[PDB]
Amino acid sequence: MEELTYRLFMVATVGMLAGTVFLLASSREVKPEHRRGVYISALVCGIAWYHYQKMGASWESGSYDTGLRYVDWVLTVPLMFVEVLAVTRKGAAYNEAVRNWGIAATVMIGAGYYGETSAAGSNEYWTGFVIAMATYVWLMRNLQAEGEGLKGDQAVAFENIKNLILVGWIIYPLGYIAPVVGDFDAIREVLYTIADIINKVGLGVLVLQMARVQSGE
Ligand SMILES: *C/C=C(C)/C=C/C=C(C)/C=C/C1=C(C)CCCC1(C)C
Ligand SMILES: CCCCCCCCCCCCCCCCCCCC
Ligand SMILES: CCCCCC
Ligand SMILES: CCCCCC
Ligand SMILES: [Kr]
Ligand SMILES: [Kr]
Ligand SMILES: [Kr]
Ligand SMILES: [Kr]
Ligand SMILES: [Kr]
Ligand SMILES: [Kr]
Ligand SMILES: [Kr]
Ligand SMILES: [Kr]
Ligand SMILES: [Kr]
Ligand SMILES: [Kr]
Ligand SMILES: [Kr]
Ligand SMILES: [Kr]
Ligand SMILES: [Kr]
Ligand SMILES: [Kr]
Ligand SMILES: [Kr]
Ligand SMILES: [Kr]
Ligand SMILES: [Kr]
Ligand SMILES: [Kr]
Ligand SMILES: [Kr]
């Protein structure tokens, strides 16, 4: 389980670099005016690459620091919302959502950190879980209500972004509780790494598909 967890960090390290550079090279496939989302997805993949390098070395040391994962999440999740909100919003409406979602994300991730760095099953562990789950549900319900005014191909492209988030982000709370269901500490790390690859690489690809639709492809 330990050696599988290590190999998955290394697979995910190269996966995030490939995400980064695949998206940068793919930016020539779309009109300059729809490229900003692709550049941000590459920056999200790039921050993750940098932290996955650290997390792999941290795991291989025998003294894993979950701080490296949670710092990755506090930076990348708000960048991922900057992308999604830009499909449907501009001016004050964009700035207010980015502010409000950004606060919610930071509280979600901070609470998770507080609980994860407590003993599994302790009142601290559950307090963290419940406060993060509530915030998570607030974000997902906000996300579900975005894009009522989109038409045709742009509407379907955005629905694919939303469904990837609505389904892919469920893996994080499953990872968080893995260590109470069994003697499976390393399975938390496995589930988080798979989620990060699906969610960062998957979102990169769907943001690219959106940039192609908006370019009239
Ligand atoms: C690129 C990284 C992403 C999208 C990471 C997302 C992380 C979460 C959505 C975490 C959510 C959590 C809960 C809802 C409950 C337990 C605590 C967390 C932080 C694992
Ligand atoms: C044309 C614009 C392209 C932007 C994306 C380029 C890809 C990013 C390169 C890697 C980023 C790594 C950043 C390292 C610092 C992470 C934070 C450190 C604090 C723990
Ligand atoms: C419209 C911006 C809100 C400012 C917060 C008091
Ligand atoms: C309705 C979402 C809450 C689920 C708690 C495990
Ligand atoms: Kr692996
Ligand atoms: Kr992976
Ligand atoms: Kr990968
Ligand atoms: Kr990607
Ligand atoms: Kr490409
Ligand atoms: Kr964007
Ligand atoms: Kr991304
Ligand atoms: Kr987007
Ligand atoms: Kr945000
Ligand atoms: Kr809950
Ligand atoms: Kr609970
Ligand atoms: Kr969320
Ligand atoms: Kr969200
Ligand atoms: Kr899932
Ligand atoms: Kr799963
Ligand atoms: Kr498990
Ligand atoms: Kr992993
Ligand atoms: Kr994966
Ligand atoms: Kr998977």
Side-chain angles (χ1 to χ4, degrees), residues 1 3-147 149-150 152-182 184-217:
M1 241 174 214
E3 193 56 12
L4 162 86
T5 303
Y6 175 65
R7 279 153 184 241
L8 275 179
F9 277 128
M10 294 301 89
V11 172
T13 305
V14 179
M16 291 300 188
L17 175 59
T20 308
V21 294
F22 163 78
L23 291 163
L24 283 181
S26 279
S27 64
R28 67 171 297 286
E29 306 281 79
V30 310
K31 295 191 206 135
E33 54 258 46
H34 305 312
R35 264 176 208 171
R36 201 200 178 70
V38 177
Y39 289 144
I40 297 166
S41 297
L43 180 59
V44 166
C45 286
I47 290 166
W49 173 54
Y50 166 85
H51 284 129
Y52 271 91
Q53 271 169 131
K54 302 290 209 55
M55 277 179 257
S58 184
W59 186 267
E60 180 177 52
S61 76
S63 200
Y64 183 65
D65 180 19
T66 198
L68 288 168
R69 177 98 72 175
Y70 274 80
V71 68
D72 192 67
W73 291 352
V74 300
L75 295 176
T76 55
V77 167
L79 284 172
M80 288 169 83
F81 295 157
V82 163
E83 305 183 67
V84 165
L85 292 176
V87 175
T88 54
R89 281 163 190 267
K90 73 198 307 188
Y94 175 78
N95 303 333
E96 189 206 329
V98 163
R99 179 186 91 241
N100 289 346
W101 292 32
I103 295 166
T106 307
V107 169
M108 183 178 68
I109 294 157
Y113 185 64
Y114 170 86
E116 187 146 328
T117 54
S118 312
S122 82
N123 182 64
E124 278 96 329
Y125 172 94
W126 289 115
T127 295
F129 177 74
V130 169
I131 289 176
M133 268 306 321
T135 313
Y136 170 103
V137 171
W138 183 89
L139 282 167
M140 294 296 97
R141 300 295 277 121
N142 282 336
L143 177 64
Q144 276 173 312
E146 289 294 294
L150 301 184
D153 276 340
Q154 182 154 0
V156 172
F158 188 67
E159 207 56 37
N160 294 327
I161 291 167
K162 283 176 37 163
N163 293 344
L164 176 62
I165 295 154
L166 288 166
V167 176
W169 291 29
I170 295 176
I171 304 164
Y172 295 108
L174 281 170
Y176 181 97
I177 63 157
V180 307
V181 182
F184 311 133
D185 261 36
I187 297 301
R188 176 173 57 199
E189 307 322 330
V190 165
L191 285 174
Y192 287 172
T193 295
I194 292 173
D196 280 350
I197 287 295
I198 290 179
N199 286 313
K200 295 201 163 58
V201 178
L203 184 53
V205 171
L206 292 179
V207 170
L208 177 61
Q209 286 193 27
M210 175 95 266
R212 283 184 185 279
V213 157
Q214 289 177 317
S215 298
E217 301 174 32

